[PDB]
Amino acid sequence: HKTISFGSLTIDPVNRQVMLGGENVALSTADFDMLWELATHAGQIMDRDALLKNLRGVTYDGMDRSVDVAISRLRKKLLDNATEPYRIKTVRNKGYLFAPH
Template structure:
């Protein structure tokens, strides 16, 4: 059974969601205050953190930002604030998703399950945290270096020029190196939207990344396509500019 911490000061909302998710094998621990949530999360080591925005002590946006250096699991904002600015800000703070409280419970369950599938933890708390864009830790794979502070990518001595969205996609893939990322997970993590089965923007961006990173366009070996599953960033395929 998966376990999540739900930071929510409205006891009725917390209990309703806890009861619903509990029927679907997700244990929910409700924490009513933002300023005590970090300690609770550190103690419980949940598979996912669900946050309201309007909280006593510390708001959900600030809490999300403060959690990111030490918590590697998915963080989802669940709020009644239907605001594009809040949606964008939450993603910049490190959230994986932004869901309105008016979302049907079955849809909420499906989206939480998606995040839990994409972030499996065989032993809760023992999975090393994935690097965050805000941590300032550059990633190195052979001759490929990805610097999140300056948003620079170099392959051997060549600087690879990427757009903001392409850099974010590369970072998302690289921080999950060796793991398959499906289109829905990539769209949710990068844009906070669900995959509708028709959107091909991720495929187009992957093709663009492959060209710029000297991947083989006919038989990609650096950013691989895993049939009917998604894409996989190969961590050991970066020893030279071209292979």
């Protein structure tokens, strides 16, 4: 009912469980809460300050790389090469974007 899917990727907030085309991908608490955020605003550029607020929530001090680190850890577990990402795009000086297609 509340489960929100994309392509072969299913994100279930009721059981806090995510599946990538049959296979069940193990995500930590941050991996999930971060992916959930992005997917909610799919195709929408989420800016760094906006991420920290919704997820921590603290103020972006203009110099904080935790979101970047969080993104990389997510990118690896989702099987998404950062060199040319299919799922989670980087947008220079804006933030990050979840790609539905």
